[PDB]
């Protein structure tokens, strides 16, 4: 068969990933511009929300060295790929868990609906990639919202998960942090309540 | 805004390391036990950030100067350079390449690293750049040292530089480690050996590149990166 | 005083490097053009100094501590150890082993070295010891860096440690260089290649020695040295 | 045939040899005890002499980075091998040429006569080994004395040199340095007046 | 009065059998699922018992005479001998070597062994000795038979003798099994094959040793044992 | 790299280990001297203690064929390697679980404090090696004491166990058996409450 | 290591080089435009100079079949790469020694000062490449001027020549030829007074 050049293989990000990709989280000096966890300026269109969560290993213990990348549509369902710290909204961001801050946070807006390649609406979602010591190739997942039940039930991606019980692992729980609208999305890498991870 | 106009060749997850590789002990509790769920490519997966409008500092790619506290870092002066292409051999221009590493003695500038090898007051160990219009990148740095780690009772990482590459989409984004030609630690490392195929391991070994050295100044290593092949959509929804 | 009571196996001067090796440019004007004159072994050649009564300082063999100006040197912590034997395999005990080297970046602590890689304020690069009663020696140091030199326009020494060994007589005394397993600079070096026989070059390459490492602390390399075979006199003057 | 373990091959001492073997000559700090160029304490038996010389390459230019080791009998014709800085006499020493001091010196006594292995007296001599950048394996020679002409003419080692003109290269010239008895022994590595070098 | 003056080469746990080797069924539930925790060597790990003054009975090393109930055991008379050295080739003198085995028909003298092959009234199957000052040990015994066991539906252990060796510290202590040259059961055994590397399996196969046989009396097998390399401490704090 | 002679590989002790190493426990006749479970004669210095425990597999079922070897300091923190049944104290012993007696016992004294190689005190501990059918290479663990909380908190070996919850698995529980001080130390080879096992 | 395509290997120009590269010197008809030995028309800015020289082999005999290529800055220290016979000045030229004319000539202007890559002024020089039968790969040298002593003493290229005596081989001697300023630059390929040749 036709064999292309092989992809460079993945390796773990390791325990010091923050020195390269999360300098403030590492407690090291930052450069003038850093890619971080505030996707939305205060006047960006849409509903401003906080996302937060904790990451657990197969023994139920906190992962205190994770690194997460996120990619989401803006409130109007458009992916903003021209990354710029001056943008009202960036569709991309980064966050982390650390020894001092075991819970990651993201400041964003609730994403608008985008269609899949067949033209079928997907429920509002955040695409997440998880990296850490012990993770040899990053784990892909999606964060959906518990107050979008009607859309979630019809999402063509959620419906590829065979078991309803597993679909529940991707549904973030609405809550309030300092009185402000938030959704909590805990990730369980292994075992009971294991979060669905995707390949694509 | 971004559009869905391409597809990416599916990953070979037997070429990449598997999740559960127990000789690398931390992988035991941090590997999913359920199967990954395959999903079709949509705009969510086939787009991603482009960093052409990110503002880079003058020395962001030069680790000899970007942590300057009165002198040069101690260690083997090297250029690390290469090309980012996709699996069809197409260059990947204007793409974000990030790197981080220990100093010449294997010590990282991180609070959690308590290795007794000292920090270097003029070394930080972090770089970034964009590939140029033809897919090439370059950094200047010092060659990192190997270091011990709490895996087996006498385990040592080979000298390495951590890399992250964005590529055209979140589907192409990759984090990996660069190793150095001839290092006798490479065959012994349980992190290297998380990759089952020896030919795949060889793809992570940077080659000494005398052609790119600055005589009387610094050596050079070449590390070419291959991201997932990108093609146009064809015959979809019909 | 010393006595003539032994003979030493004649050197193989095609195993050793020849004097004139023009790719190593300095050898052109510093090589004799007349043949060496062979002379028989006498007490003058078959005796030599023994250094058992030389006073060594506490850190003479420990380059991590013997140039201590407030900290440890930067670089790859290593033990360099091995055995000195003669060609018959007999250990050579209580013999003087001296060594010197550049720092982690290839800079020597000598006025004539103006390489732009900085000096390390806590590294001097000089060691000595005696082999023990079973012929073994050991040093602790940092792995030296390669460095450029004014031979060809882009020539670089492989990482190396210079060694001198006394042995039982002035006939056995040797100066050489230790190189490190896997270094891709070794095949390229005109000083290495002053040795014509590839098998002889391999005798100068120290092997990574995980068995002798201090876990969580330092790696180790093994460099065994072979001096000329010593035998008793037999059937002389009869 | 019988093949023993091969000897470790030689390599050049290189231009920084002094940092390892001639620390004072290198201008670096010395250790409490160093092996250097004063073989004789003032009260050692015998005739106290200074030896000195310069080393030349094949273009007639000074070698300003050489390192020399010497081995000689004491005044009574005995080799003193128990090296000790407290000894009245050491048969071994070291010296060097440098950028600042292109001429090496040795402070010693004139050696007594020793017999070769057949019982034939050798003329008084100093055994010398020469090391430097550009010298891949050290060069062996001997320094004999111009005021021992009768002994030199009968030396079984000098007489192994086929040509009388070449024998002359090993004969040091009596002179006076600061009014004191000295012998000068210049070495020419290559070309006109090339010094005899030995194999044994 | 034991002292911390030595270090032992770290074990290669891919040379040894891994814990989880599911074709050996009992290992499935008796293998840790968490990683081992590496700890540095201290006096706790680098010392161990010396048995120089353990009192041995006259026949403790001689299984032909140490269960004497009126006659000799039935079976192939053999000497089993060898040397204990460390990985540097240094002999391990005055060290405890213990062994146990089935009789000629594969039957052990234990209540839990209900194999229909009979017990031998003159065989117990247990030995011990100390290595001599040069590291050599020897036993006299009968060659044990293979036997079936409840693993797969037709699994048979190759003929084997169980060994335990103390060595200089608790870090060197080892239990293993000796197999016999040429036994066609060896490549088929899931306990043998708990060892992944075929070169490591070969290290457990005792060689026929005609040189050490007593003519007209008994054959001999040679089984050398390598314990972890011991070195002096260096450059520690 | 340098490769030494490979170590002889381990194999399981198998189901009949007691016939070779625990003769009394096997129900077989003993020899005049056996290595067994009484480390301390009543006259030995220190606090006399009974140790007991059960061993469990990954399904929570008793292991009724295990063999244990123990190594501990005397009450003054000294390891006694000269094994002799005439000694008031031996640092080494053996015990077992069997079909008739699923709970192993040891009769010893509480060990004194021993420093690690860096001079840091370790909490009082007994070193244990566990052998059985199904165990291909023996498992190393340590038994610490619940009435040494302060020392345990500072032990440099305990502190190499990343998770506090796992450190708890090595702490034996003080009780009284027939009026005598005892500690229970259960080992769980696999699964919930899995005992920490060491490599060194 | 990284290995590129190998360079095409050199071969000697051979005895008939002039038929291809110095047609007038070969005694053969010329084409309308030839690259020859007049770098400067009389109207060019700068000091007009005649250069001349002879080439010698290792036995001290004239080389009567050499071919030389020269490359130099204009009087303002700028290299002019746009070769055109209509130019008042070209930075490049060719000359030759032949059986009829053993002394090559060049008609040029004195080059201005050019900085090295580190910004350090080089003394005025003409770059020369020498080809001939017996020369397997061409020899690179530089012609400097004896009336630029101060500049020559400070030239970073001259100062890479270890021996002052060898630096003298690159200094052309000012004279007058038919009333016009000239410099003689003889090249000695081998032996006494051997001209310094460069690699770059
Ligand atoms: Fe790393
Ligand atoms: Fe050097
Ligand atoms: Fe058995």
From Swiss-Prot, chains A, D, F, G:
UniProt GO molecular function: ferric iron binding; protocatechuate 3,4-dioxygenase activity
Reaction equations catalysed: 3,4-dihydroxybenzoate + O2 = 3-carboxy-cis,cis-muconate + 2 H(+)
EC class (word): oxidoreductase
Subunit relationships: The enzyme is an oligomer of 12 copies of the alpha and beta chains.
Swiss-Prot/TrEMBL cofactor(s): Fe(3+)
Name of this protein: Protocatechuate 3,4-dioxygenase alpha chain
UniProt keyword list: Aromatic hydrocarbons catabolism, Dioxygenase, Iron, Oxidoreductase
General function of this protein: Plays an essential role in the utilization of numerous aromatic and hydroaromatic compounds via the beta-ketoadipate pathway.
Species, as recorded: Pseudomonas putida
Keyword Iron annotated: yes
Encoding gene (name): pcaG
Curated annotation (Swiss-Prot), chain E:
GO biological process, one term: beta-ketoadipate pathway
Alphabetic keyword roster: Aromatic hydrocarbons catabolism, Dioxygenase, Iron, Metal-binding, Oxidoreductase
Class of this enzyme: oxidoreductase
Cofactor note: Binds Fe(3+) ion per subunit.
Catalyzed chemical reaction(s): 3,4-dihydroxybenzoate + O2 = 3-carboxy-cis,cis-muconate + 2 H(+)
Gene3D superfamilies assigned: Aromatic compound dioxygenase (2.60.130.10)
UniProt xrefs under CDD domains: 3_4-PCD_beta
GO MF annotations in UniProt: ferric iron binding; protocatechuate 3,4-dioxygenase activity
Cofactor: Fe(3+)
EC numbers on record: 1.13.11.3
Chain sites annotated for binding Fe cation: 108, 147, 160, 162
Pathway the protein takes part in: Aromatic compound metabolism; beta-ketoadipate pathway; 3-carboxy-cis,cis-muconate from 3,4-dihydroxybenzoate: step 1/1
Keyword GTP-binding included in the entry's annotation: no
PROSITE patterns membership: INTRADIOL_DIOXYGENAS
S-adenosyl-L-methionine among keywords: no
Role summary: Plays an essential role in the utilization of numerous aromatic and hydroaromatic compounds via the beta-ketoadipate pathway.
Assembly and binders: The enzyme is an oligomer of 12 copies of the alpha and beta chains.
Protein family membership: Belongs to the intradiol ring-cleavage dioxygenase family.
Protein name: Protocatechuate 3,4-dioxygenase beta chain
């Amino acid at each position: 068969p036709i064999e292309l050049l092989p992809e460079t293989p993945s390796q773990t990000a390791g325990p010091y990933v923050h020195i390269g990709l999360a300098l403030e989280a590492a407690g090291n000096p930052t450069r003038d511009q850093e890619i971080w966890n505030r996707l939305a300026k205060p006047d960006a269109p849409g509903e401003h929300i906080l996302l937060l969560g904790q990451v657990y290993d197969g023994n139920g213990h906190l992962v205190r060295d994770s690194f997460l990348e996120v990619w989401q549509a803006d409130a109007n369902g458009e992916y903003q790929d021209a990354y710029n710290l001056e943008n009202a909204f960036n569709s991309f961001g980064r966050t982390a868990t650390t020894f001092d801050a075991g819970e990651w946070t993201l400041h964003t807006v609730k994403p608008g609906v985008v269609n899949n390649a067949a033209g079928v609406p997907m429920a509002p979602h955040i695409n997440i990639s998880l990296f850490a010591r012990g993770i040899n190739i990053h784990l892909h997942t999606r964060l959906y919202f518990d107050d979008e039940a009607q859309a979630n039930a019809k999402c063509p991606v959620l419906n590829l998960i065979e078991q309803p019980q597993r679909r529940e692992t991707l549904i973030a729980k609405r809550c309030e942090v300092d009185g402000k609208t938030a959704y909590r999305f805990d990730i369980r890498i292994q075992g009971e309540g294991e979060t669905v991870f995707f390949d694509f | 805004p971004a559009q869905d106009n391409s597809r990416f060749v599916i990953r070979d997850r037997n070429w990449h390391p598997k999740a559960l590789t127990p000789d690398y002990k931390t992988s035991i509790a941090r590997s999913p036990r359920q199967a990954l769920v395959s999903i079709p490519q949509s705009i969510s997966e086939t787009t991603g950030p482009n960093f052409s409008h990110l503002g880079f500092g003058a020395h962001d790619h030069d680790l000899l100067l970007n942590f300057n506290n009165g002198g040069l870092p101690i260690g083997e002066r090297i250029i690390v350079a290469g090309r980012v292409v996709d699996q069809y051999g197409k260059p990947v221009p204007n793409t974000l390449v990030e790197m981080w590493q220990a100093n010449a003695g294997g010590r990282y500038r991180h609070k959690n690293d308590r290795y007794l090898a000292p920090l270097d007051p003029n070394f930080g160990g972090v770089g970034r750049c964009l590939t140029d219009s033809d897919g090439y990148y370059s950094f200047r740095t010092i060659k990192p040292g190997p270091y011990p780690w709490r895996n087996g009772p006498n385990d040592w990482r080979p000298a390495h530089i951590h890399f992250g590459i964005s590529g055209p989409s979140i589907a192409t984004k990759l984090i990996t480690q660069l190793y150095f030609e001839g290092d006798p630690l490479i065959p012994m490392c349980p992190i290297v050996k998380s990759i089952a195929n020896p030919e795949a391991v060889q793809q992570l070994i940077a080659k000494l590149d005398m052609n790119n050295a600055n005589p009387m100044d610094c050596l050079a290593y070449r590390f070419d990166i291959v991201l997932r092949g990108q093609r146009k959509t064809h015959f979809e929804n019909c």
